[PDB]
Amino acid sequence: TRPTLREAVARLAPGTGLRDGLERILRGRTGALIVLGHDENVEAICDGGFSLDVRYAATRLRELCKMDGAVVLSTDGSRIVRANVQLVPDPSIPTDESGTRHRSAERAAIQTGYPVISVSHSMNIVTVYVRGERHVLTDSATILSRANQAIATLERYKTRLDEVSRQLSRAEIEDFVTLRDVMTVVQRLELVRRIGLVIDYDVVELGTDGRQLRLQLDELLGGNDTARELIVRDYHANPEPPSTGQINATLDELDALSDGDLLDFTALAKVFGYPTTTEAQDSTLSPRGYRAMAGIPRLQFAHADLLVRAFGTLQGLLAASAGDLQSVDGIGAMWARHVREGLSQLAEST
């Protein structure tokens, strides 16, 4: 049940007691070497030092780290057990680290199974070792600059997504949609998602410092998963409306594609089920109407799903009379007038 690397980095994320202590250590320029566990195996490699039983605090961690040596914490992290200790792990344990402190850190994490942090006195750099794996913490200021650059590109990817999405809707009304038109929106939908994943990683590392960025990212992305779901159900090559499993499977195959493959429209076609040939890109497609219904304001997907499965195509849905929509079981009178008005208003703009 030893902790994983990703689990350990969370323990050092902003807003935690450990991270508060490490920030004090960094401002003190003392350097440090911390062991996040204590048992018989850890004590076997711990030399001399001091044996103390004190409650953990960020200030207490800094003061004990003013002394040369290593501080050891209990497994639960609630107590500081030892300070000034000399770690003496088995030298046979391999490590490609530099310096006595950092090489001792990796060897110690490997032998005991617990994480070990090493703050460089000369470089003010925090590094955590867990089972031969290494992750370097980054100051929240640098991460925020990375995420704000990505937010700028995400805003532009949303602007281009909106322009090509509007173009596809206009083509759906005129019934001259091509596969190239759909795969143009598919590419932009995925690019928005991928930049979103980049920013999400930056948000997690920011801990409490990323709460403000969490709001900005969730609003800009918001509705992207709905859009990717709607384009798949509207334009999947399989004639019958896709099952809930089939939609998720197609979206997963899209995520599996490389960044270089997203630029290839033919690769995007394979995921939907169309041929990879250049002639297929020019081919006409007939939308089912899922996207058009979603455009209608205040229309829940449950209502639109019955109508799209019933009428089959966006052109039986458009030509429908308000009474025809009502016949479908589960569609109320009032909703039939609202949908018939919605499709008519879509025809006026385009």
Q: Which is nearer to a second copy, 141 or 240 (CB)?
A: 141
CA end-to-end distance (rounded Å), the chain:
61
* Structure token digits, residue 348: 């006026």
Site for Br ion in 98-157 (CB under 5 A): 120-122
Site for ligand 2BA in 75-94 (CB under 6 A): 86-88
Residue-level length of the chain = 350
For residue 220, the Cα-to-chain-centroid distance in whole angstroms is 14
Using the contact rule CB under 6 A, the part of the chain among 62-70, 159-167, 195-203, 224-232 near ligand 2BA is 62-70
Q: What angle do CA 23, 10, 99 make, to 5 degrees?
A: 60
Q: Which is nearer to Br ion, 106 or 209 (CB)?
A: 106
Residue 70 interacting with ligand 2BA (CB under 6 A) = yes
**Residue in the block written with tokens 């950092």:** 102
**What's the Rg (C-alpha) of the chain?**
29
Residue 167 interacting with a second copy (CB under 8 A) = yes
Residue 33 interacting with ligand 2BA (CB under 6 A) = yes
CA distance 6 to 57: 23
Is 87 assigned a ligand-binding role in the annotation? yes
Using the contact rule CB under 8 A, the part of the chain among 94-102, 240-248, 305-313, 317-325 near a second copy is 94-102
Q: Which is nearer to a second copy, 53 or 329 (CB)?
A: 53
Least spacing, CB of residue 33 vs ligand 2BA, in Å = 5
The site map against Br ion for 70-109 (x = CB under 5 A) is: ----------------------------------------
Please tell me what DSSP assigns to residue 16: S
Q: Which is nearer to a second copy, 88 or 257 (CB)?
A: 88
Using the contact rule CB under 6 A, the part of the chain among 36-44, 54-62, 97-105, 187-195 near ligand 2BA is 97-105
Question: Among candidates 75, 100, 76, 74, which has minimal Cα distance to 88?
Answer: 100
Instruction: Please provide the DSSP assignment of 103-127 as one string.
Output: HHHHHHHHHH-S-EEEE-TTT--EE
For residue 151, the Cα-to-chain-centroid distance in whole angstroms is 14
46 close to 114: Cβ distance less than 8 angstroms: no
Is 103 assigned a ligand-binding role in the annotation? yes
Reduced to 3 DSSP states, what percent helix, strand and coil does the chain have, rounded to the nearest 5?
60, 15, 25
Please tell me what DSSP assigns to residue 208: G
Residue 306 interacting with a second copy (CB under 8 A) = no
Cα–Cα distances (Å) from 266 to 138, 204, 219, 271, 276, in that order, read 40, 35, 31, 9, 5
Q: Which one among 11, 20, 56, 57 touches a second copy, defined by CB under 8 A?
A: 57
Using the contact rule CB under 6 A, the part of the chain among 95-103, 226-234, 286-294, 336-344 near ligand 2BA is 95-103
Using CA of residue 180, residue 183, residue 187, residue 189, what is the dihedral sign? positive
Interface contacts to a second copy, rule CB under 8 A? 24, 27-28, 45, 47-48, 50-54, 57, 59-60, 63-64, 66-69, 84, 86, 88, 91, 96, 98-100, 103, 122-125, 141-142, 144-146, 148-150, 152-153, 156-157, 160, 167, 171, 174, 176, 178, 180-181, 195, 212-213, 215-216, 219-220, 284, 297-298, 300, 334, 338
Residues at the interface with ligand 2BA (CB under 6 A): 33, 68-70, 86-88, 99-101, 104
- Annotated binding residues for ATP: 69, 87, 100-104
